[PDB]
Structure 1
Amino acid sequence: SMSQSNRELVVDFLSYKLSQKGYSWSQMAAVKQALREAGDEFELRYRRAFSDLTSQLHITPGTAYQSFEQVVNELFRDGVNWGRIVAFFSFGGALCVESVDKEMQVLVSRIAAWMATYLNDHLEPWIQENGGWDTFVELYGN
């Protein structure tokens, strides 16, 4: 328990320090780091679209899924691409922050579950057809 959590902290810290030098702890660590960076990049470049989105958000536990679904359906209306997948993660992140800001922290675990289901059902088939997350890492790094 303390043993597993100590190994987890070590792995997390070393994954981070290796990534800062262009190295990686594992394939999964390389995906996680490249997605974190892509999220930061997307949010900064589309800071206006991010600001317009958060301003229009009126989060309540009863309308949270509705808001999630409407944005995600609009986002992927014309199909899937890596850029839109990054925007999907950025949107989930913004909805979680907005939930915590509005003292609705209970929504965070729900949003993560909705994201994971949407990924499994609607994004994973396209991801697998397009070479998987390794292709994303390769394309983003280039």
Structure 2
Amino acid sequence: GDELYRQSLEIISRYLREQATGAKDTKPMGRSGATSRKALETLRRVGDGVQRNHETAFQGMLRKLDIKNEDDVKSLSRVMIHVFSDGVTNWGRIVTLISFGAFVAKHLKTINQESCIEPLAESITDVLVRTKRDWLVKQRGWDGFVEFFH
């Protein structure tokens, strides 16, 4: 996974954390950090409407999952894979995956389970990169993500 994986995890966990708490890391990267910031800016921008517009499907999804603990979060992978894989793959679908992650993360802070946010982000990244690796590489990874939403 390397650089695409490292970059994806950094963006998605920071995004899920900011959405739940606070917030800001104000922390280094400091890697391919120009790309990461821009992607974090666009995701913050694009993620905006998406959460609101799907407040209904999201709420429906959330009740249906009944997430209460760390063991619950660790079993979401295949349901994630089931809703996300088969179809058109495009950046809107990817932002919906991550936006729902943020939605779940906020719920996690609500039931006082902020500690599950990080394994949640890790799980989402693992699903994003394993099911969409070749599409992602083809789109210039996160650099391309910004252009589609400029």
* TM-score for the superposition, normalised by structure 2: 0.67
Q: How many angstroms apart in 2 are the aligned matches of 1:38 and 1:125?
A: 23
Q: Which of 28, 33, 46 is the aligned partner of 1:38?
A: 46
| Counterpart position of 1:48 | 56
Q: How many angstroms apart in 2 are the aligned matches of 1:133 and 1:74?
A: 22
The one-character-per-residue Cα deviations of 1:14-63 (angstroms, maximum 9, x if unpaired) are xxxxxxxxxxx933321110011111121122222222223323113333
Code of the aligned partner of 2:95: V
Whether the aligned pair in 1 keeps the contact of 2:77 and 2:127 (CA below 8 Å) is no
Code of the aligned partner of 1:78: G
Question: 3-state DSSP class of the match of 2:52?
Answer: helix
Give the greater-gyration-radius structure (CA). 1
| Counterpart position of 1:104 | 113
Whether the aligned pair in 1 keeps the contact of 2:73 and 2:119 (CA below 8 Å) is no
Give the 3 Å change call, closer, same or farther, for CA 37–69 of structure 1 in structure 2: farther
| Counterpart position of 1:76 | 85
Code of the aligned partner of 2:128: L
Say whether 1:132 aligns with 2:141: yes
The one-character-per-residue Cα deviations of 1:65-101 (angstroms, maximum 9, x if unpaired) are 3234303421222242111100111121122222222
Query: Which structure would you say has the larger RCO, counting Cα contacts within 8 Å and 6 or more residues apart?
Result: 2
Whether the aligned pair in 2 keeps the contact of 1:72 and 1:88 (CA below 8 Å) is no
- Unmatched tracts of structure 1, length 5 or more: 1-7, 13-24
Q: How many angstroms apart in 2 are the aligned matches of 1:120 and 1:54?
A: 23
Whether the aligned pair in 2 keeps the contact of 1:61 and 1:107 (CA below 8 Å) is yes
The count of residues paired between Structure 1 and Structure 2 equals 122
Code of the aligned partner of 1:112: A
Whether the aligned pair in 2 keeps the contact of 1:76 and 1:84 (CA below 8 Å) is no
Q: How many angstroms apart in 1 are the aligned matches of 2:137 and 2:81?
A: 20
Give the 3 Å change call, closer, same or farther, for CA 107–28 of structure 1 in structure 2: closer
Q: How many angstroms apart in 2 are the aligned matches of 1:33 and 1:76?
A: 25
Q: How many angstroms apart in 2 are the aligned matches of 1:88 and 1:138?
A: 19
* TM-score for the superposition, normalised by structure 1: 0.70
